[PDB]
């Protein structure tokens, strides 16, 4: 690579157990520059080296910081195509840093419109076969999440914050989430609400059956650190 970078970490909370489920790793510059400032440097001649560097940096920092729950890693959209040769680097990093593979979750975001779902399906089912956890990252925004779910199911579906925002007072968003939550339960998929910013949102989601949540209400990302979570969701 021509550049270097590091990671921030944002906690995912289990509101039913009031414990931390894990942390999502998010790229930052060496002086806490934005993720977009780093990702904008990636190109077709870069993507595979960068993707491997994100995974190894995330595992190594998580190890150094003493992470004992889940580590969630964003998978650079257009996949490594052949999940065989390229998965080696991740399995070796996990072994070398003694980070259990079943405590690593990969979050999947589509690059382009998914005409043939088999490719991304193949990668998700291969990762599951190795013991990784898997998630759909952007349900309710960007590309069609139902197009994905119709042909394969991840362990977790992360619901975009756009569907979450002000849900305690938005009847249309309440209907969407009530019916999507029933869908996820029918498919044996665990939902995770992203972008929770207020107690009012959290309380509605909790009453609606959501356990896993993420967002500034709980904690912002911590540069090269594991942020502690707002005690207010454990109180209230």
Q: Which of residues 152-171 bind its own copies (CB under 8 A)?
A: 153, 160, 162-163
Residue tagged 């709980």 (tokens) = 218
Residue 37 or 166 with smaller CB distance to its own copies = 166
User: By CB under 8 A, is residue 142 in contact with its own copies?
Assistant: yes
Q: Which of residues 133-152 bind Ca ion (CB under 5 A)?
A: 137-138, 142-145
> Which tokens belong to 178?
């009530």
CA-based radius of gyration for the chain: 17
> Which tokens belong to 28?
């930052």
Annotated binding site for Ca(2+): 24, 74, 107, 109, 137-138, 141, 143, 194
Q: Which of 43, 45, 85, 172 binds its own copies (CB under 8 A)?
A: 172
Asked if 146 and 118 count as a contact pair (C-beta separation under 8 A), the reply is no
Annotated binding site: 7, 10, 24, 27-28, 54, 74, 107, 109, 137-138, 141, 143, 194, 197, 216
CA distances from 37 to 27, 34, 51, 140, 189 (A): 9, 5, 15, 25, 33
Residue 95 or 220 with smaller CB distance to Ca ion = 220
Maximum distance among all Cα pairs of the chain, rounded to whole angstroms: 50
State the nearest-atom distance from the C-beta of 176 to its own copies, in Å.
Answer: 6
Q: Using CA atoms, how far apart are residues 160 and 164, in angstroms rounded to an integer?
A: 7
DSSP letters for 113-128: --S--HHHHHHHHHHH
Looking only at the bridges linking them, the beta strands covering 19-28 and 6-14 are: antiparallel
Asked if 164 and 205 count as a contact pair (C-beta separation under 8 A), the reply is yes
User: By CB under 8 A, is residue 116 in contact with its own copies?
Assistant: no
Annotated binding site for 3',3'-cGAMP: 7, 10, 27-28, 54, 197, 216
CB atoms within 10 A of CB 45: 7
User: By CB under 5 A, is residue 71 in contact with Ca ion?
Assistant: no
User: By CB under 5 A, is residue 201 in contact with Ca ion?
Assistant: no
Q: Which residues pair with 73 in a beta bridge?
A: 106
State the nearest-atom distance from the C-beta of 110 to its own copies, in Å.
Answer: 10
Q: How many residues bind to Ca ion according to rule CB under 5 A?
A: 10
Residue 15 or 120 with smaller CB distance to Ca ion = 120
Contacts to Ca ion by CB under 5 A: 74, 107, 109, 137-138, 142-145, 158
Contacts to its own copies by CB under 8 A: 113-114, 138-147, 149-151, 153, 160, 162-163, 172-173, 175-176, 178-180, 182-183, 186-187
């Amino acid at each position: 690579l021509d550049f270097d970078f590091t990671m921030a970490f944002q906690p995912i909370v289990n509101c039913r157990t009031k414990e931390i489920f894990g942390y999502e790793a998010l790229v930052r510059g060496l002086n806490n520059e934005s993720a977009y400032s780093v990702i904008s440097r990636v190109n077709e001649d870069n993507r595979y080296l960068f993707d491997q560097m994100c995974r190894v940096k995330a595992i190594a920092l998580a190890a150094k910081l003493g992470l004992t729950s889940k580590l969630s890693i964003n998978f650079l959209p257009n996949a490594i195509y052949v999940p065989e040769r390229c998965i080696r680097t991740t399995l070796e990093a996990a072994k070398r840093y003694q980070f259990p593979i079943e405590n690593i979750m990969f979050e999947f975001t589509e690059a382009e419109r998914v005409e043939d779902v088999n490719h991304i399906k193949r990668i998700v089912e291969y990762y599951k076969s190795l013991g990784f956890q898997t998630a759909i990252d952007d349900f309710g925004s960007g590309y069609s999440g139902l197009n994905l779910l119709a042909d394969f199911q991840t362990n977790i579906v992360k619901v975009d914050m756009g569907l979450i925002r002000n849900i305690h007072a938005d009847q249309v968003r309440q209907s969407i989430m009530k019916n999507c939550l029933k869908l996820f339960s029918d498919l044996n998929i665990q939902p995770l609400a992203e972008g929770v910013e207020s107690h009012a949102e959290f309380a509605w989601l909790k009453a609606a059956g959501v356990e896993l949540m993420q967002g500034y209400y709980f904690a912002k990302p911590g540069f090269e650190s594991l942020p502690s979570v707002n005690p207010e969701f454990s109180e209230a």
